[PDB]
Design a protein around this ligand. Structure first.
Ligand code: BJL
Ligand code: CL
Lengths: 26, 247
């Protein structure tokens, strides 16, 4: 599913970003 | 300040670019964070957290620990974009649809999303009562707002929720009174140099996920500094009594 693919690609970038931003907000 | 995703999932082009533009402003590295992540093909595959389900022999306090562990696994959302729009006046059945989607899509969350999830995940526990508790605090010339899900089991009080601070969310249902639970939160805020200004207490939420009733977020509003310690306690115990009598 193209929509499912988009959501999986986005979720990976969201969690990669969240790690960086969490490390920043310590 | 936060942006809210209002187009559902997947995040549309405008909302996704807005999120990255926001990151570039906030993060000292700025554009290099996006350069490293956007389009990267080696990013970690994050497991979808398993929604907790309970045997009938598991005691409710142990279930609450598992619900809180689940909420925590989603992670606190530090991206600057909230991925689910929460309209607090929605019928419960629509907020429960949203909670289901939160478990399916498994993205980071903040305090209000956590409250909705806590309801969704404890509707299977009729011997537990759930009611929102909201806080307004003050630090360094600014006000902060926070929300947790109050819970009542076997005449004791606890809380579920999500905060960036460990002592501003989960409380095991061990507090003998509602007063003791809220005063614990007040002390935790004091320790991180916030002054508690207001507490807002909701009513108990139906365990029917198809209920059309609204959540009542601000049934009781307590001005902490004006009431003073003794009337603060008195009002808190009055809200607790009303809830119990109404059940
Ligand atoms: C809930 C929320 O995220 N609350 C935050 C508040 C906060 C506390 C301390 C610092 O330093 C920053 C922010 C939390 O407890 O981490 C809020 O996002 C929401 O959804 O609605 C609140 C009415
Ligand atoms: Cl206010």
């Amino acid at each position: 599913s193209a929509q499912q693919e988009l959501k999986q690609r986005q979720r990976a970038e969201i969690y990669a970003l969240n790690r960086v931003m969490t490390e920043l907000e310590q | 300040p936060f942006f809210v995703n209002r187009g559902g999932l997947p995040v549309d082009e405008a909302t996704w670019e807005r999120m990255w533009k926001h990151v570039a402003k906030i993060h000292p590295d700025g554009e290099k964070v996006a350069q490293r992540i956007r389009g990267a093909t080696d990013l970690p595959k994050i497991p979808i957290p398993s929604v907790p389900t309970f045997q009938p022999s598991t005691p409710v306090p142990e279930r609450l620990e598992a619900v809180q562990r689940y909420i925590r696994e989603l992670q606190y959302n530090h991206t600057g974009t909230q991925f689910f729009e929460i309209k607090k006046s929605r019928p419960l059945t629509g907020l429960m649809d949203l909670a289901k989607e939160m478990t399916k899509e498994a993205l980071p969350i903040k305090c209000l999303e956590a409250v909705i999830l806590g309801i969704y995940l404890t509707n299977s526990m009729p011997t537990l009562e759930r009611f929102p508790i909201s806080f307004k605090t003050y630090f360094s010339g600014n006000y902060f707002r926070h929300i947790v899900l109050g819970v009542n089991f076997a005449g004791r009080y606890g809380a579920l929720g999500m905060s960036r601070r460990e002592d501003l969310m989960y409380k095991p249902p061990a507090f003998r009174t509602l007063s003791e639970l809220v005063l614990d939160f007040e002390a935790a805020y004091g320790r991180c140099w916030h002054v508690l200004k207001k507490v807002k207490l909701g009513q108990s939420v139906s365990h029917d996920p198809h209920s059309v009733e609204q959540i009542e977020w601000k049934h009781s509003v307590l001005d902490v500094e004006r009431l003073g310690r003794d009337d603060f306690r008195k009002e808190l115990e009055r809200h607790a009594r009303d809830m119990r009598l109404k059940i």
